Structure 1
Amino acid sequence: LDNGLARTPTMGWLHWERFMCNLDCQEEPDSCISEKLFMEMAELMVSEGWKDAGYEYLCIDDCWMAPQRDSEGRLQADPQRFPHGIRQLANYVHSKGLKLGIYADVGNKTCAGFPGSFGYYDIDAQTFADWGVDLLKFDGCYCDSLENLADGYKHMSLALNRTGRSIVYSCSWPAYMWPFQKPNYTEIRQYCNHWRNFADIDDSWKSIKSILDWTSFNQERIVDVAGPGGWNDPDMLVIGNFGLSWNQQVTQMALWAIMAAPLFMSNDLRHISPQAKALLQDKDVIAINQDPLGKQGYQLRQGDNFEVWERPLSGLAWAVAMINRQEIGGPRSYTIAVASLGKGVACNPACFITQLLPVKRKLGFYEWTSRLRSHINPTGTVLLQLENTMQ
């Protein structure tokens, strides 16, 4: 989408995976979807380094709305959970140097069942603009046909544009086509800053595997179309939560960088371990994700329960990731010819290799004809950065 936004993958925080649609502020006041939750996160995004690391969008997912539109046909914030309204929230978020995302739906209802925007695209567009909304995640639930799905995503795009406000537009369009029709990503990119392709992530290794396997199975179809201002969205980071082992968290952070995915944390910033904080704020790994060239990585090979993925970076550099998919035994030896990496050219005549994950460590110079040997933990990933010696 040629709106000047998302020139690198968007970074921020999204409430959904961790907090979902908890509307019970009587029993669970510290975890229900309320203005207070978001004010608290915005404070922590500044004070604990998230903004500095580059996480700047603070994003409301589903279940912020009141059940009914108002008399003028507008979506209303829920009055008991957001008593001061979205405008005041946006102002508060803006006063911290952060940006506000919000959620709406292309069809008649949101997935959680609140008012959808079908029949109100322009009004909802105007409302968000006026409130000072900086990003819109637009879901594809309760949409009766694919014609109506496309038209809606397009109409809202144009609507957002006509407001004159810069708003990052995140679509779920191709996800709700699959596997009923073949998305045309040239069309989709004309209208969207990013797009979800696949099923909802959850807090599981099954989920991460399934997203990586789906992406590599479909990479020939979706990798080339991504770039500055138009990205593949494989959904949230679930690092720092409950259901992934440390090695599986690293795999996610490594592969989200390789994939040029937007980086939306979904966790509790009030209760996050120093290790998860460290991984999510890893400067070198974020730098890979935020590479200005915006060329999305891909799976180079699979075999023997190993996976090799690689991403072309700027400055004649490459990021390479090796995953161990064997979920039994110990760390496993993997050996690859550096001549196979970077389409032959990463290490011609030589390259310097730095391990970034799971720990940072310089490996040294590797000549074109040589071999790389790593030990990779079960469900873990080694992330390497290759620097050609031609500069």
Structure 2
Amino acid sequence: SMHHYQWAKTPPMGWNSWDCYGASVTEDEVKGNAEYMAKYLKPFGWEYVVVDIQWYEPGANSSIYRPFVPLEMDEYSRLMPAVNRFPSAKGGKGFKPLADYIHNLGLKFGIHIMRGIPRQAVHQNTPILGTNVGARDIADTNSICPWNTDMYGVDHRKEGAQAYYDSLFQLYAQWGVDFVKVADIVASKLYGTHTEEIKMIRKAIDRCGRPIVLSLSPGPAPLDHATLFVENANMWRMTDDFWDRWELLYDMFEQCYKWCKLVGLGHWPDADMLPLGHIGIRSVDGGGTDRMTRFTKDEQRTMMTLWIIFRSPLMFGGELRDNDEWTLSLLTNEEVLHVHQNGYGARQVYRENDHVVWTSQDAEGNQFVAMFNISEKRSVVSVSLKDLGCMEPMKARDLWAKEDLGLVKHQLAFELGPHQSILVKLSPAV
């Protein structure tokens, strides 16, 4: 139905600067992560290089924002990259040089934006491109983000509002942006879901003439607005910010269950960025500091396995260049990725005593089974072939291990440690 679905036929895969560098990533760091992606990851589907929040804030240095500070901005109330952090933006060029480079590696470029219009634009009453009204005239008088002070909300009822959003995406399209992550737009302690601005953004993107994938954050996204999100966004966060803490991983199983019927081509409920590898370099969120992920290997696999079978977007959050061989291996298994790229129909077969089984399939008849022990005790996790919809014996294969497992006659069953999972492919026997 919606033409923008075609811009994310499979769930976006990429890297994002938040979990490693907070609000404070530099051009060099972005370039380095992109080169690593081009060399090691691109053949496996990884393509978006996403510069997260506050690229326009020259003093940023953490995940903790510096409030009420001046921001880099043009003459039409549009935020611009901080030239100290992004030297190629010198001379009003913005992100075009960086995006060109990223494109020339065969990759795509993404940026984060905050909903609304900068508070400094409203206070100075700076202009809006393509109209005579000023920033001050389109601002909402009672709309802010509770966790960031950079913007005021824009009031769609005002003349000039749509013109401002159109102008942002004209700029982003000039730069060659392929992906935008909009924040303060879905969940808000204060206001709930900013529906009208979602619609203005959809329209601005559609008018800008370039394919720009739309990601919405933070969650929890309400199910009440499922139609709105399905029709307007290519991805939307199911959850508040995800981090390397078991509790949050445990909690994702329920959210996936809740959203599984809205997952489809072009429209991807989002389990959030993968806190893997080296994170917290200039971030202080998630209760950690400079570290390798606190997920155990079993946990890392369990996460990847859930996000894969569910078909969450996959946005690696660590500094890629500090990957070890284990971490890289999680990203380069073609057999596992097939489940994410070509699987469909994922569903929870059952959840009982903190054992969970999910299943999906491909069009070639392969069935994929993810089996999870999310309890604190080692146990056998099993599922009958009948509950999977398989009426005869099947062959099984362990996709992470790339190992044939042999014939299965009545049930799949595996000993799994606490927090441990397995991902299996079933195919006809003999």
TM-score range, shorter chain: 0.7 to 0.9
In the superposition, relative to structure 1, how do residues 62 and 136 fare at CA in structure 2: closer, same or farther (>3 Å)? Answer: same
2:195 matched to which residue of 1? 150
1:12 matched to which residue of 2? 14
Q: Secondary structure at the match of 2:32?
A: helix
8 A contact 2:237–2:270 mirrored in 1: yes
Residue number among 361, 364, 386 corresponding to 2:406 in the alignment: 364
Tell whether 2:269 aligns with 1:232: yes
8 A contact 2:96–2:176 mirrored in 1: yes
1:127 matched to which residue of 2? 171
1:115 deviates by: 4.4
Identity of aligned residues (%): 28
Query: Matches of residues 188-207 of structure 1 in structure 2 within 5 Å?
Result: 188-207=229-248
Between the two proteins, the alignment pairs up a number of residues equal to: 359
1:157 deviates by: 0.9
Q: Deviations over 1:343-386 (max 9, x none)?
A: x2xx22332211123x232112334xx12221112211011111
2:48 matched to which residue of 1? 57
Tell whether 2:150 aligns with 1:114: yes
Q: Which amino acid aligns with 1:333?
A: V
8 A contact 1:117–1:124 mirrored in 2: no
Tell whether 2:380 aligns with 1:333: yes
1:383 matched to which residue of 2? 423
8 A contact 1:2–1:190 mirrored in 2: no
Q: Work out the CA distance in 2 between the residues paired with 1:371 and 1:361.
A: 18
1:317 matched to which residue of 2? 366
Q: Secondary structure at the match of 1:195?
A: strand
1:169 matched to which residue of 2? 214
Q: Which amino acid aligns with 2:31?
A: M
1:313 deviates by: 2.5
Q: Which amino acid aligns with 1:82?
A: F
Q: Unpaired segments of 5 or more residues in structure 2? A: 58-70, 90-94, 119-144, 155-160, 278-291
Cα RMSD of the aligned pairs, angstroms, is: 2.2
8 A contact 2:357–2:383 mirrored in 1: no
Tell whether 2:102 aligns with 1:93: yes
8 A contact 2:372–2:381 mirrored in 1: no
Q: Which amino acid aligns with 1:265?
A: F
Tell whether 2:334 aligns with 1:283: yes
2:81 matched to which residue of 1? 77
Q: Deviations over 1:107-166 (max 9, x none)?
A: 45675443467353122111101110010111126976457x111011111101111101
Q: Work out the CA distance in 2 between the residues paired with 1:352 and 1:51.
A: 31
The two structures have a TM-score, normalised by structure 2, of 0.78
1:245 matched to which residue of 2? 296
1:25 matched to which residue of 2? none
Which deviates further from its counterpart, 252-261 or 135-144? 135-144
Q: Secondary structure at the match of 2:426?
A: strand
8 A contact 2:115–2:151 mirrored in 1: no
Q: Work out the CA distance in 1 between the residues paired with 2:220 and 2:152.
A: 16
Which deviates further from its counterpart, 373-382 or 89-98? 373-382
1:210 deviates by: 1.6
2:251 matched to which residue of 1? 210
Q: Deviations over 1:18-50 (max 9, x none)?
A: 22124xxxxxxxxxx111110111111122x11
Q: Work out the CA distance in 2 between the residues paired with 1:138 and 1:14.
A: 13
In the superposition, relative to structure 1, how do residues 188 and 77 fare at CA in structure 2: closer, same or farther (>3 Å)? Answer: same
8 A contact 1:140–1:176 mirrored in 2: no
